[PDB]
């Protein structure tokens, strides 16, 4: 199975470039501002990465430069928005339905 | 669980715009040229869409204009590449890794 369907979108507003790692920050909309936190895994259109820090409604994520070229993450540009979805490192997974 | 990890990438080479639907074509690399076919579901960085047609190594996919704005698919631009992964409409037993 697979849906690639996103809970909501994010607005690229700032790029943070560190010679050790690349960092990108987006602006979380009203329905993604709630629940998300640092260390969370956000998938941008389906590419999972973790929150390095939250700048209020904004969230910076970490991104390896070679991973950026290897992935299609490098394509991101500020002023654009991203399909963002919340991912969890671990879950109880009782079952439910 | 969630990985957002892509089998390989695709190069946007042509956009096909139809007033009824928007169409986008990418260039499939050597390890994605094998196996993929029209009517298949490719996820571009994790957004699943179906192949409208294959142009040799290229593949055009369908994309609704409002879906494009609602998603972050509209962000695509020719000359760029995309994280592309193969998805199947149905499987005997999730026999896909
Ligand atoms: C659970 C998970 C989290 C990941 N997080 C990131 C990330 O925060 N930044 C990144 O550039 N790649 C991330 N990746 C991509 C992966 O670690 C690796 O970089 C690519 O698969 C190959 O470059 C993640 C992959 C997985 C499975
Ligand atoms: C299985 C599946 C396939 C989808 N295929 C496409 C597609 O080919 N083109 C597109 O613009 N959206 C596609 N979507 C997105 C979805 O149908 C719908 O457009 C968005 O969730 C809301 O606009 C697909 C969603 C699912 C679950």
Curated annotation (Swiss-Prot), chains A, B:
Segments annotated as Lumazine-binding repeats: 1-97
Disulfide bonds: none
Chain sites annotated for binding 2,4-dihydroxypteridine 2: 48-50, 62-67
Binding site for 2,4-dihydroxypteridine 1: 4-6
Domain of life of the source: Bacteria
Protein role: Catalyzes the dismutation of two molecules of 6,7-dimethyl-8-ribityllumazine, resulting in the formation of riboflavin and 5-amino-6-(D-ribitylamino)uracil.
Subunit structure: Homotrimer. Unlike in B.subtilis, does not interact with 6,7-dimethyl-8-ribityllumazine synthase.
Protein name: Riboflavin synthase
């Amino acid at each position: 199975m697979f849906t690639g369907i996103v809970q909501g979108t994010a607005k690229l507003v700032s790029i943070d470039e560190k010679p050790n790692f690349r960092t990108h920050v987006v602006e979380l909309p009203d329905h993604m501002l709630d629940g998300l936190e640092t260390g969370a895994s956000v998938a941008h259109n389906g590419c999972c990465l973790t929150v390095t820090e939250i700048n209020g409604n904004h969230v910076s994520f970490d991104l390896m430069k070679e991973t950026l070229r290897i992935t299609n993450l490098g394509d991101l540009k500020v002023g654009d928005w991203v399909n963002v979805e919340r991912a969890a490192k671990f879950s109880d997974e009782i079952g439910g339905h």
